[PDB]
Design an enzyme around this catalytic site. Sequence first.
Site, PDB file in Angstrom:
ATOM      1  N   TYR A 218       1.665  -2.753  -0.056  1.00 27.65           N
ATOM      2  CA  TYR A 218       1.261  -2.403   0.300  1.00 27.65           C
ATOM      3  C   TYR A 218       0.713  -1.706  -0.667  1.00 27.65           C
ATOM      4  O   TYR A 218       1.133  -0.279  -0.498  1.00 27.65           O
ATOM      5  CB  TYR A 218       0.430  -2.067   1.833  1.00 27.65           C
ATOM      6  N   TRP A 292       0.284 -10.932   4.080  1.00 31.45           N
ATOM      7  CA  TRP A 292       0.226 -10.309   6.012  1.00 31.45           C
ATOM      8  C   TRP A 292      -1.835  -9.703   6.147  1.00 31.45           C
ATOM      9  O   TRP A 292      -1.920  -9.025   5.453  1.00 31.45           O
ATOM     10  CB  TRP A 292       1.125  -9.006   6.111  1.00 31.45           C
TER      11      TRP A 292
END
EC number: 3.2.1.35
Length: 324
Positions: A218, A292
């Site tokens: 991320y 995601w």
Amino acid sequence: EFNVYWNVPTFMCHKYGLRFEEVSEKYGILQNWMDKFRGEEIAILYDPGMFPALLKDPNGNVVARNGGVPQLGNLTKHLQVFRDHLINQIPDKSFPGVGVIDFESWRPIFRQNWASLQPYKKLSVEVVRREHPFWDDQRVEQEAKRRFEKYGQLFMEETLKAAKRMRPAANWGYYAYPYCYNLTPNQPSAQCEATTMQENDKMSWLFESEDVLLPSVYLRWNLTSGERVGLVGGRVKEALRIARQMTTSRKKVLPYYWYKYQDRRDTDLSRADLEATLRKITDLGADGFIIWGSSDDINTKAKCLQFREYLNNELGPAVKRIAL
């Protein structure tokens, strides 16, 4: 071979008529039939079973789910619950897709439960002190760690074998392993923290039984552009490092990628950031990646439409030009 998988919960937008068919029809991203969350391509299990953990009421009382710490938990009670979720969550016995267990309550290495995972070290030490009032500090901590580590491994290894027993053709892996902690307070450069590397070599029991390593990559907005590329790069090399030492079978590296900046969720990744970071993944030699998303970022008609726009104007195209 380089496959991209879609694990964004766009089933939340089906009620408004948006089925995101273009994910696979135009951008070639592997997608579960009919855009269902769990299907034949991928299935993520969020906190399945009854993993021991420490939770908090809004009241403020600490609840110790199934022991709190691994060494206090009921393994067999965890595994029946785990087997019954799995039956319903992935109903097909021949499921050959990527199977992801998202278990984030504690890390299996005692040292790594820092910052907010600290209550797990405190509690572990407290159980021993209550048992042995006359033992000295050092003796206590040593035994706390021994206990937590033995049973941390046991809870993780046993759940993964249960998954594999039940769905033998899936590719199982734990979300976020291996950790690297690069560009962190513990390790403030783009290189993984050195003790984590030795701890990852000591965790052959996990990486040998998994089929896929799933480092979370991320990005953060509060980082230079170089650091964002270095964030992803350091984590994927480490996975690759581990992956080439494995011996039971080939291991796939499929890093978990999010389209929002973690410290700034209102902002979607820039096109500049998408291309440099996806090129990093691809040049490093991973087997693909997993996109995601949270159901809170697409939980209204307005948001679904905006994500759809970004899908078609930025994310999809980048995915199609670089990665595929």
